[PDB]
Amino acid sequence: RFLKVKNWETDVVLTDTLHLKSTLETGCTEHICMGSIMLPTKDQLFPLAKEFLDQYYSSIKRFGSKAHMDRLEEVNKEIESTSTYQLKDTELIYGAKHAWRNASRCVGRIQWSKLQVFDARDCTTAHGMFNYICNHVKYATNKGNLRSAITIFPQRTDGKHDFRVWNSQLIRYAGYKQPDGSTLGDPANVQFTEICIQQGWKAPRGRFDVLPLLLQANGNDPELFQIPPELVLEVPIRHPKFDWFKDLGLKWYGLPAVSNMLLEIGGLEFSACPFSGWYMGTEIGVRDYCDNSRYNILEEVAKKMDLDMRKTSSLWKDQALVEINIAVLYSFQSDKVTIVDHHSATESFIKHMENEYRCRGGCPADWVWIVPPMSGSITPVFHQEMLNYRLTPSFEYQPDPWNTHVW
Amino acid sequence: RFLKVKNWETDVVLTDTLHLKSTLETGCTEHICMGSIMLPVRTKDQLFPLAKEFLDQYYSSIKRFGSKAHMDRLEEVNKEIESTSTYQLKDTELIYGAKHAWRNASRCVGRIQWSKLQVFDARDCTTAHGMFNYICNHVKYATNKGNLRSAITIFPQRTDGKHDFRVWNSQLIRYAGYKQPDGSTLGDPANVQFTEICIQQGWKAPRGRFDVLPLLLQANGNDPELFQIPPELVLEVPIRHPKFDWFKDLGLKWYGLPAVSNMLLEIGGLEFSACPFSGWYMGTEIGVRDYCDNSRYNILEEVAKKMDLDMRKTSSLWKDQALVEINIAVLYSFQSDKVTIVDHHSATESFIKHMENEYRCRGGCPADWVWIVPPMSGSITPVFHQEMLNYRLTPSFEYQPDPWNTHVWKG
Numbered sequence: 001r002f003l004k005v006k007n008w009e010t011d012v013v014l015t016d017t018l019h020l021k022s023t024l025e026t027g028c029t030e031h032i033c034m035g036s037i038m039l040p041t042k043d044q045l046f047p048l049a050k051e052f053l054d055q056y057y058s059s060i061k062r063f064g065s066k067a068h069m070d071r072l073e074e075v076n077k078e079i080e081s082t083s084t085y086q087l088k089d090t091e092l093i094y095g096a097k098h099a100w101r102n103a104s105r106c107v108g109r110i111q112w113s114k115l116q117v118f119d120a121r122d123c124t125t126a127h128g129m130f131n132y133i134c135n136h137v138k139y140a141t142n143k144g145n146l147r148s149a150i151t152i153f154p155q156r157t158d159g160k161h162d163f164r165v166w167n168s169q170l171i172r173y174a175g176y177k178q179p180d181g182s183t184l185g186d187p188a189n190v191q192f193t194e195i196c197i198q199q200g201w202k203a204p205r206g207r208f209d210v211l212p213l214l215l216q217a218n219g220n221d222p223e224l225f226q227i228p229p230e231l232v233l234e235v236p237i238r239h240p241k242f243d244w245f246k247d248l249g250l251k252w253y254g255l256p257a258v259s260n261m262l263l264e265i266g267g268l269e270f271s272a273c274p275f276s277g278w279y280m281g282t283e284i285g286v287r288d289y290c291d292n293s294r295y296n297i298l299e300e301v302a303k304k305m306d307l308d309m310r311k312t313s314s315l316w317k318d319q320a321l322v323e324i325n326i327a328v329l330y331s332f333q334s335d336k337v338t339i340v341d342h343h344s345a346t347e348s349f350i351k352h353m354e355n356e357y358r359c360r361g362g363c364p365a366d367w368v369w370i371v372p373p374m375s376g377s378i379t380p381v382f383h384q385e386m387l388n389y390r391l392t393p394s395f396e397y398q399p400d401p402w403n404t405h406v407w
Numbered sequence: 408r409f410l411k412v413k414n415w416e417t418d419v420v421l422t423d424t425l426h427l428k429s430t431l432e433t434g435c436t437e438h439i440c441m442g443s444i445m446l447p448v449r450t451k452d453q454l455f456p457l458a459k460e461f462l463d464q465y466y467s468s469i470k471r472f473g474s475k476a477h478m479d480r481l482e483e484v485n486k487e488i489e490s491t492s493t494y495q496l497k498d499t500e501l502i503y504g505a506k507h508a509w510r511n512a513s514r515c516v517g518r519i520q521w522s523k524l525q526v527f528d529a530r531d532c533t534t535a536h537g538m539f540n541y542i543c544n545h546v547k548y549a550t551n552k553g554n555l556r557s558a559i560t561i562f563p564q565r566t567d568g569k570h571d572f573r574v575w576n577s578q579l580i581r582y583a584g585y586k587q588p589d590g591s592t593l594g595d596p597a598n599v600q601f602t603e604i605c606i607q608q609g610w611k612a613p614r615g616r617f618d619v620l621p622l623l624l625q626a627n628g629n630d631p632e633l634f635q636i637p638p639e640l641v642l643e644v645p646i647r648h649p650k651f652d653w654f655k656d657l658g659l660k661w662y663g664l665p666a667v668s669n670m671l672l673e674i675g676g677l678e679f680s681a682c683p684f685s686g687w688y689m690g691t692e693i694g695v696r697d698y699c700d701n702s703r704y705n706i707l708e709e710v711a712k713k714m715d716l717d718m719r720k721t722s723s724l725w726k727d728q729a730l731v732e733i734n735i736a737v738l739y740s741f742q743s744d745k746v747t748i749v750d751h752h753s754a755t756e757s758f759i760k761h762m763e764n765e766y767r768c769r770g771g772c773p774a775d776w777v778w779i780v781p782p783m784s785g786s787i788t789p790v791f792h793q794e795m796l797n798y799r800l801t802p803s804f805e806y807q808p809d810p811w812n813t814h815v816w817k818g
């Protein structure tokens with residue numbers, strides 16, 4: 001019931017109690033671990049509201065005060081009367097920060113209390129959503145000095161009036177299947193790109209076309225908008241030693257802004273809650289650039305480096321991988337766009353875990369996601385035991401809107 | 408019930424039914440995943456079902472399930488249990504059990520090889536000198552002058568838990584570690600405690616950076632005894648780099664034979680507390696973990712110094728750069744000296760083919776992603792992208808407490 005995690009590099013042992021608060025389920029049982037699987041009414045709502053308000057009033061050292069009891073009463077009356085309820089601004093801010101705090105898959109959570117929350121609950125139309133989103137983009141981008149932010153659209157009601165951003169990130173590149181056989185642009189986004197085209201976007205059909213936003217207000221049919229190009233900060237990718245690197249024609253965008261997740265606070269569901277922080281270098285250089293199913297550029301880079309691609313045991317992939325990642329970091333830094341390397345980010349996270357154990361009694365963490373996709377055991381998180389469990393408020397996955405939406 | 412796993416690179420979906428045969432527990436619950444936790448005297452009562460289930464599996468594998476030989480064997484084991492309180496495995500069943508413990512080892516990336524395992528039956532062994540002789544023969548056989556062959560040597564099973572056979576060493580071949588008065592370590596920091604035990608037992612330590620430890624061998628619950636493996640049996644590879652000529656001057660070498668000796672083999676409820684086994688190295692075990700872990704030889708700084716990388720900011724990726732060079736060096740050295748080694752690309756690719764084969768023919772392959780994914784270049788290996796289900800099948804290899812924590816000293 002009280003659980004120990006050990007760091008095997010430093011022998012530091014932490015004791016977890018926070019897991020006993022855990023409410024939602026993991027996918028695992030006593031008979032089978034699913035640790036590596038990517039995706040494992042009135043009656044229901046009041047317990048969820050109560051649990052949330054309890055922790056909120058606890059956090060401001062007013063647990064069991066008249067202000068606490070009154071609010072519980074007030075929300076209870078509102079649920080009974082209206083079958084839903086509204087969060088005070090203070091509760092919404094607390095809820096959003098805590099959803100990030102509780103994100104077991106996020107290595108950047110040392111930052112969790114510095115999150116700018118944009119309340120867009122008064123939004124009613126897709127043009128309105130576009131306006132809020134451009135404002136988020138500009139605020140978060142901050143000319144390269146990136147700031148963490150979330151923009152929160154109205155909560156689900158009867159679920160036939162959902163707000164959704166159809167995009168997976170606010171800023172992403174299109175992907176096109178070619179008449180010849182290959183893929184141009186980002187292969188991850190072929191189906192979304194097609195939806196845009198079918199809805200009427202005219203694609204310039206290049207390798208790096210910033211997708212248009214596809215915005216759905218109030219359960220309505222989604223609409224297209226182009227983010228003003230001037231709000232999209234992009235970085236040309238060069239290498240501090242290899243002059244030929246620039247000729248590869250690689251660029252990436254500065255702002256990682258995830259827009260397809262669902263924020264759950266006190267039982268309320270925010271189906272449109274685009275949020276943004278800043279990149280860890282490996283996301284672009286290892287995953288975006290080198291996944292065989294992504295831009296998949298390892299082959300081309302190795303050639304330019306004139307490496308022995310005959311045998312896997314020359315480690316040519318590994319050599320080229322490192323160079324690509326040096327170049328990503330160098331390019332962002334040269335252009336003064338916030339980026340974090342995997343050594344710095346994981347070291348920060350170890351510190352954050354220690355803070356959380358010390359101040360909160362634990363920190364849910366998913367080792368499979370937290371350890372970087374390159375150089376795992378030379379980062380301290382590799383050697384850190386982690387306990388994974390589900391706390392609310394939370395960010396959750398939801399099915400892509402096009403499989404759900406009734407036109 | 409059917410469970411699906413997806414590969415997110417290929418979209419290949421596999422269906423697992425084998426998990427239904429799993430009895431032992433994982434550590435996980437519906438409320439907590441313990442997937443990254445490193446480590447998460449039987450009565451007659453508990454013994455007969457364990458024996459029965461095992462013999463049922465054995466007889467099925469030989470297509471003799473429910474045969475007269477199957478039934479007579481169950482009856483003979485049952486009578487032997489309630490009379491003698493334990494039972495002896497036939498040679499065929501021992502071989503089958505040792506292979507399956509390997510097949511079932513969810514943290515093992517090299518399991519494509521599981522059916523090629525040389526089993527040495529050392530159950531007639533009685534003394535530590537006897538153990539030493541078995542172990543030397545194992546080493547010489549497995550080494551095969553660089554053309555490594557997988558093998559296991561199986562000493563007598565646990566009886567009352569007071570007469571255990573144990574190899575105190577964690578691997579048959581491993582380098583000594585010496586904690587210095589100034590707090591620095593000479594040799595391998597992983598083996599300081601064990602090195603101290605050996606010294607106390609009377610080993611004369613050469614005190615260098617790569618001293619092969621003596622064997623500390625326990626037979627029949629007696630105090631363990633020290634023995635030196637003949638040096639001519641210990642194959643070693645000096646480490647050099649194909650392009651960097653100063654690399655040799657780092658003074659590095661490693662041994663060819665990885666031979667884990669501190670695990671417990673469980674077959675049909677029987678416990679084999681001394682069952683040293685050996686395969687061959689995946690290059691990252693030495694080049695990533697043994698050489699570059701901060702708590703091990705920790706050579707990253709000196710290597711990057713010599714490469715003259717920019718070391719003032721971690722964002723130069725000097726560590727990642729030095730890591731790749733060291734790992735190229737390890738593979739190059741082993742290949743050049745004709746000692747078996749596998750790189751992490753080849754090994755993970757083979758594992759994926761093994762796993763798909765196992766799903767088709769066996770209905771599953773239990774696998775621990777946390778261990779299967781290599782400790783460098785994780786996502787450019789196919790296993791990173793592969794969903795895996797971790798569950799526990801028997802026969803199995805299990806951890807056991809270090810023997811110095813539990814041994815009752817005779818004196």
Ligand code: HEM
Pocket residue numbers: 100103105106107108109111115148149150275276277278279280283340345369395
């Ligand atoms: C401030 C800089 C931040 C850094 C460096 C960072 C780092 C990361 C990284 C590297 C991932 C893994 C994503 C992947 O591999 O696809 C991740 C996951 C995640 N982070 Fe962050 N994070 C940051 C800010 C944020 C913010 C502001 C939020 C929300 C308010 C957040 C919530 C999440 C969530 C929910 C996941 C899991 C996503 C999923 O399951 O697909 N993070 N974080």
Ligand code: HEM
Pocket residue numbers: 505509512514515516517518520524557558559684685686687688689692749754778804
């Ligand atoms: C034949 C070549 C083999 C290769 C390349 C190989 C590869 C590996 C590697 C790289 C590990 C992880 C080691 C670590 O990080 O500590 C491992 C784990 C393991 N392998 Fe193998 N393996 C081989 C043969 C064997 C053999 C012969 C056995 C036993 C008969 C075996 C049973 C295991 C077990 C039980 C583990 C888990 C160890 C633990 O939990 O500490 N493997 N394998």
Ligand SMILES: Nc1ccc2ccc(CNCCc3cccc(F)c3)cc2n1
Pocket residue numbers: 038039108256258276277278279280283
């Ligand atoms: N730098 C950051 C910060 C927060 C992030 C939050 C989310 C993400 C992207 N996560 C998507 C992972 C994913 C990919 C493909 C399928 C899937 F189910 C899930 C990236 C982030 N990067």
Ligand SMILES: Nc1ccc2ccc(CNCCc3cccc(F)c3)cc2n1
Pocket residue numbers: 445446517665667685686687688689692
């Ligand atoms: N090449 C091989 C083959 C089989 C192996 C079997 C076991 C191992 C070593 N595993 C050590 C695991 C370990 C290290 C430190 C603490 C701990 F609890 C467990 C290495 C192997 N290498």
Ligand SMILES: C[C@H](O)[C@H](O)[C@H]1CNc2nc(N)[nH]c(=O)c2N1
Pocket residue numbers: 035036037038368369370415791792793794795
């Ligand atoms: C199958 C496996 O769970 C999958 O490839 C995971 C592994 N770890 C990951 N870790 C992070 N941060 N991001 C990912 O997309 C993944 N993918």
Ligand SMILES: C[C@H](O)[C@H](O)[C@H]1CNc2nc(N)[nH]c(=O)c2N1
Pocket residue numbers: 008382383384385386442443444445777778779
């Ligand atoms: C805490 C964590 O579980 C631990 O460091 C593990 C991670 N994965 C590993 N994987 C392998 N193959 N070997 C190891 O020693 C480890 N160590």
Ligand SMILES: [Zn+2]
Pocket residue numbers: 028029032033034035435439440441442
């Ligand atoms: Zn689990």
